[PDB]
Design a protein around this nucleic acid. Structure first.
Ligand SMILES: CC1=C(/C=C/C(C)=C\C=C\C(C)=C\C(=O)O)C(C)(C)CCC1
Ligand SMILES: O=C(Nc1ccccc1)c1cc([N+](=O)[O-])ccc1Cl
Ligand SMILES: [Zn+2]
Ligand SMILES: [Zn+2]
Ligand SMILES: [Zn+2]
Ligand SMILES: [Zn+2]
Lengths: 9, 363, 289, 10
DNA sequence: CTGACCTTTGACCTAGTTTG
DNA sequence: CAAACTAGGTCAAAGGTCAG
């Protein structure tokens, strides 16, 4: 969720 | 007096077709000609050592031809003037390699090796003969379940507590002996006995563990582990099968072993690496650090040169093998958090009094 | 000639140290080469006959091991500048990004770790799943390796990445002095007494980052590579900026074991601290735990 | 301190 | 994926070569 | 000739294929 967010962009 | 082959680097069986070749190439060649075999082409300059040899029939029947190997120069008879080359490979080229400072690094490497051989019985050498079946010994009695264990547990015996508890409680004496060997090996490391005897003990308290798994890997493979002097072979699968907390006890070591064995380190290489672990100035409880670290400095110096010489083609191995020192620390701390679990949920632990000492206040 | 001690079929030779039928011989051989991991759907109690041996692979292979079939016996299938990891991007990366009090700095530094990681060559270049995994597997070790370097010039205490000198004492009493001591002496000191520049510490953090073992890496071969790259790179670096000290590259890589020993102990703690609920732990720290 | 032993014995 | 079927290897053994 | 070696044959055992 989070870590995947800072990475998704 | 014990040269090697010129095509693959294996031990040479003799002077075949005007050139020192292994009983393997000698036959390959005598068979290429003998049957006129015309191996398909291939450009890639293929390195040719012991195992890659049978990788490309064209590059092998090439290299040999490219260093003598003629159905002509086959010089029969008795060796007339060995002398000329009875000074081994590095003869006059030796007063270049058997020097300068490294001449001594070479010495140290040997010492620790020759010492390693007298300290521990079952060397990597042996264990591999066994696990490869290339030995005039009987195949170790494989132990994959209760029937095989119940059976071999008598065949070679020296208290009915429990299978899971017998398996591991019963090896405690090897750990101990192991610890005893390491220790005598430690003294053979230039300058160990001299170091404040107080740190001497510390360096071991924390050393043996990591040194144990390093050794314990030579006997291992993906499918199991050698035991009982190497006359037995317990399976990875069976162990994985033990009860509640005892099944995932030896797992961490197999994973580690499968990786550590990829480096393909031999006794010569492992004899030094080991010495480096005992002499780690980063052990808690040390105060005479500098000394301890000085030796590691020189041992490492020796180690590195040994990997270059021994394993000519193996990228960043020195750096790769050091990385293993980090996996070892994890294995131990992990192994301890476990033996802690046991302490709290079991009631038979009863560790030997020496394993007792070492494990106390470890991590 | 004989009877395969695995299924009963006709042997016709000894294979891999055991009298075995051609079928079994080939089963074993492939299992070993293609590195296959079979699984029993039943009770690992499957019989193996000349017929129905192909029934379950797991039981069959294990039957091989039991009957003493040697794996190492299987030979190996007969077939077939230096700045790919520039020391600058690293250094530049280790730059641009700089008990209940420690978990605030921890969490804070977590968001910024994704930044550092992004800047480290080829990292964001490999699958997002691995980017997660790699950061999941080593956030604590990374984070510790950095504040520990920061607390280098600082005395008997660390400097949280928010400005909170956590002098020893404060800890030995705070309950967590057992580890706070090791962090100082096995990391801080060692680094200080070695004057570890922050280009080196960056390469070490990178080495920790590119961890090929980290469970689940789509293509771990990839990761074990970028790591070897940093190996090559940093080695040379120590060679250029530090000619007097040959054994530097080694002494640097050897700062890593402790980093993991310690690292593991910390995580051990943050747990009997987590699903307890006695002290605050922010969100990013929850996804990581 | 039982290692002191093995260390202190030829 | 299996496994009947077919080619290579290379560890030994042996009969013939050459040196002292 | 005895002693010191080797080309060459030998066959268990390990490698490879590719219908089924
Ligand atoms: C080290 C350490 C701990 C754990 C924290 C972790 C995993 C990371 C901290 C990162 C910081 C403080 C980063 C920064 O801001 O630079 C605990 C709480 C068990 C106690 C004291 C020692
Ligand atoms: O049980 C073992 N080791 C052990 C147990 C408790 C604490 C430390 C090591 C074991 C050791 C060895 N060894 O040392 O060669 C071999 C096999 C086992 Cl199962
Ligand atoms: Zn050869
Ligand atoms: Zn080729
Ligand atoms: Zn069979
Ligand atoms: Zn099954």
């Amino acid at each position: 969720k989070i870590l995947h967010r800072l990475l998704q962009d | 007096m014990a040269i090697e082959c010129r095509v693959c680097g294996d031990k040479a069986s003799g002077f075949h077709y005007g050139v020192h070749a292994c009983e393997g190439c000698k036959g390959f060649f005598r068979r290429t000609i003998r049957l006129k075999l015309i191996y398909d082409r291939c450009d890639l300059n293929c390195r040719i050592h012991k195992k890659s040899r049978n990788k490309c029939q064209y590059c092998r029947f090439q290299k040999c031809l490219a260093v003598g190997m003629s159905h002509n120069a086959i010089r029969f008879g008795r060796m007339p003037q060995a002398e000329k080359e009875k000074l081994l490979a590095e003869i006059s080229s030796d007063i270049d390699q058997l020097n300068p400072e490294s001449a001594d690094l070479r010495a140290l490497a040997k010492h620790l090796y020759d010492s390693y051989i007298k300290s521990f019985p079952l060397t990597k050498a042996k264990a591999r003969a066994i696990l490869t079946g290339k030995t005039t010994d009987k195949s170790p009695f494989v132990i994959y379940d209760m029937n095989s264990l119940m059976m071999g547990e008598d065949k070679i015996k020296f208290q009915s507590k429990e299978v899971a508890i017998r398996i591991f409680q019963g090896c405690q004496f090897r750990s101990v002996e192991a610890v005893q060997e390491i220790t005598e090996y430690a003294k053979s490391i230039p300058g160990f006995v001299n170091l404040d005897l107080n740190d001497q003990v510390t360096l071991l308290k924390y050393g043996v563990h990591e040194i144990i798994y390093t050794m314990l890997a030579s006997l291992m493979n993906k499918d199991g582990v050698l035991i009982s002097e190497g006359q037995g072979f317990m399976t990875r699968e069976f162990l994985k099968s033990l009860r509640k907390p005892f099944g995932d006890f030896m797992e961490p070591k197999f994973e580690f072993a499968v990786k550590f064995n990829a480096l393909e380190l031999d006794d010569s290489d492992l004899a030094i690496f080991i010495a480096v672990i005992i002499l780690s100035g980063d052990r808690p409880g040390l105060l005479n650090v500098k000394p301890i670290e000085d030796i590691q400095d020189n041992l490492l110096q020796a180690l590195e040169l040994q990997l270059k010489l021994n394993h000519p083609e193996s990228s960043q191995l020195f750096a790769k093998l050091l990385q293993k020192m980090t996996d070892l620390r994890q294995i131990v701390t992990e192994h301890v958090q476990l033996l802690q679990v046991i302490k709290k949920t079991e009631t038979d632990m009863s560790l030997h009094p020496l394993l007792q000492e070492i494990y106390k206040d470890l991590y | 000639k004989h009877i395969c001690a695995i299924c009963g079929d006709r042997s016709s030779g000894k294979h891999y140290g055991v009298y075995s039928c051609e079928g079994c011989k080939g089963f074993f051989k492939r299992t070993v080469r293609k590195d296959l991991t079979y699984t029993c759907r039943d009770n690992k109690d499957c019989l193996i006959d000349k017929r129905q041996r192909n029934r379950c692979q797991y039981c069959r292979y294990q039957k091989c091991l039991a009957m003493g079939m040697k794996r190492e016996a299987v030979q190996e299938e007969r077939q077939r500048a230096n700045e790919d990891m520039p020391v600058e991007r690293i250094l530049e990366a280790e730059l641009a990004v700089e008990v209940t009090n420690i978990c605030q700095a921890a969490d804070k530094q977590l968001f910024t770790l994704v930044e550092w990681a992004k800047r480290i060559p080829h990292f964001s270049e490999l699958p997002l799943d691995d980017q997660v995994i790699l950061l999941r597997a080593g956030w604590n070790e990374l984070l510790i390796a950095s504040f520990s370097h920061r607390s280098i010039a600082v005395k008997d205490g660390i400097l949280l990445a928010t400005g909170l000198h956590v002098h020893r004492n404060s800890a030995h009493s705070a309950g967590v002095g057992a580890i706070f001591d090791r962090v100082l002496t096995e990391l801080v000191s060692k680094m200080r007494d070695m004057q570890m520049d922050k280009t080196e510490l960056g390469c070490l953090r990178a080495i920790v980052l590119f961890n090929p073992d980290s469970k689940g890496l789509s293509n771990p071969a990839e990761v074990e590579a970028l790591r070897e790259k940093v190996y090559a790179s940093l080695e040379a670096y120590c060679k250029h900026k530090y000619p007097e000290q040959p054994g530097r590259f080694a002494k640097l890589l050897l700062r890593l074991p402790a980093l993991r020993s310690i690292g593991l102990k910390c995580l051990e703690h943050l747990f009997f601290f987590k699903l307890i609920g006695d002290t605050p732990i922010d969100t990013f720290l929850m996804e990581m735990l």
